[PDB]
Amino acid sequence: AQNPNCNIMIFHPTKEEFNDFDKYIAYMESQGAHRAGLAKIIPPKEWKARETYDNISEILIATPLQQVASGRAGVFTQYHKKKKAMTVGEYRHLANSKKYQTPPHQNFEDLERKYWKNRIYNSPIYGADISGSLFDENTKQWNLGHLGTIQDLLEKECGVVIEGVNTPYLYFGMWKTTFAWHTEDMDLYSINYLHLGEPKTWYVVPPEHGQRLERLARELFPGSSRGCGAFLRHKVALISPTVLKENGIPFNRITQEAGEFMVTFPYGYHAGFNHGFNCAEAINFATPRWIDYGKMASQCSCGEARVTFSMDAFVRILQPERYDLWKRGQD
Ligand SMILES: O=C(Cc1nn[nH]n1)N/N=C/c1ccc(Br)cc1
Ligand SMILES: [Cl-]
Ligand code: NA
Ligand code: NI
Numbered sequence: 001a002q003n004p005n006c007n008i009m010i011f012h013p014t015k016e017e018f019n020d021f022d023k024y025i026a027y028m029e030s031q032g033a034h035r036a037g038l039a040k041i042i043p044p045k046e047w048k049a050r051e052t053y054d055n056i057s058e059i060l061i062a063t064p065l066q067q068v069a070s071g072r073a074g075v076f077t078q079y080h081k082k083k084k085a086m087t088v089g090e091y092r093h094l095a096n097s098k099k100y101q102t103p104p105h106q107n108f109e110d111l112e113r114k115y116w117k118n119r120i121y122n123s124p125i126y127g128a129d130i131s132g133s134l135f136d137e138n139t140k141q142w143n144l145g146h147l148g149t150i151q152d153l154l155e156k157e158c159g160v161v162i163e164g165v166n167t168p169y170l171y172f173g174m175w176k177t178t179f180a181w182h183t184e185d186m187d188l189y190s191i192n193y194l195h196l197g198e199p200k201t202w203y204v205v206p207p208e209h210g211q212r213l214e215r216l217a218r219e220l221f222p223g224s225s226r227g228c229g230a231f232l233r234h235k236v237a238l239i240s241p242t243v244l245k246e247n248g249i250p251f252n253r254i255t256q257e258a259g260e261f262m263v264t265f266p267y268g269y270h271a272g273f274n275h276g277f278n279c280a281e282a283i284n285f286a287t288p289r290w291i292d293y294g295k296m297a298s299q300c301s302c303g304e305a306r307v308t309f310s311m312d313a314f315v316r317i318l319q320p321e322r323y324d325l326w327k328r329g330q331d
């Protein structure tokens with residue numbers, strides 16, 4: 001059995017191997033990559049996402065989100081306070097201001113220590129979930145706006161057409177901006193490209209151990225857990241690596257740099273933070289192996305999560321017994 005310790009694997013596809021996206025995902029899984037929950041893919045040297053990033057300052061961040069924490073340094077929740085719109089150029093200047101800029105640090109490990117020590121005492125502002133793409137239309141390999149759709153995957157595997165569309169999102173980050181512990185909607189895969197700027201550090205729990213993280217989260221956030229049997233779906237809970245280690249939770253960590261892709265696998269819980277000003281693009285996707293995870297994925301029906309139009313058909317077809325309750329939670 002490949003990758004039995006569930007380590008994060010790093011791949012260096014050649015230009016030929018970079019042509020067929022689905023085939024390379026399958027290849028990584030044949031090597032056990034999915035057991036970690038996350039893999040890094042370094043594109044071949046001949047590849048580029050677009051020519052330059054010199055002309056992005058006029059993109060609008062319609063609803064920047066200030067991420068306000070509550071709790072303790074290693075066990076906290078965050079809520080998103082809406083701020084006034086600003087352009088990417090204005091956001092970059094804000095990220096680099098004294099209030100928000102990355103502090104002096106010696107290496108990624110020093111910055112990680114500073115993050116977990118000090119995150120709760122600041123409220124960084126995040127450009128998240130902006131529909132759009134920065135891939136050039138002429139980039140034919142690993143273009144996140146040109147992947148096969150999840151709707152087409154479900155039709156190919158299970159035989160029925162469904163409504164819905166699947167498009168990418170942009171994320172503009174700054175120091176301390178945080179993504180809470182979660183799996184993807186319907187336990188889908190995700191792919192993430194860091195277009196420009198400073199790194200993003202990731203933490204991940206192997207899919208085979210995801211229930212261990214859920215159990216700890218219920219213990220550490222007891223009111224939240226009483227409110228919703230799938231409250232991690234709300235994407236607001238943070239637990240530090242120190243607390244995970246103290247509780248024996250299996251996990252790994254890795255830092256992504258500009259020009260690198262990360263793939264998260266079905267039911268791989270992940271969380272992390274941005275080191276400084278950056279821009280990432282991400283989208284969910286499916287493969288034949290996802291179907292069984294989609295059929296079993298937990299759902300939030302308490303109201304909080306209230307997700308995409310496209311999730312309706314996935315619940316409707318893959319989880320008919322749960323559909324009516326889930327739908328009540330969306331309205
Ligand atoms: O601004 C910072 C460091 C920072 N200090 N505090 N927060 N971040 N790096 N920017 C990098 C960058 C790369 C490519 C393009 Br295009 C535009 C900007
Ligand atoms: Cl700090
Ligand atoms: Na490990
Ligand atoms: Ni995610």
Ligand SMILES: [Zn+2]
Pocket residue numbers: 227228229230231233234300301302303304305
């Ligand atoms: Zn809920």
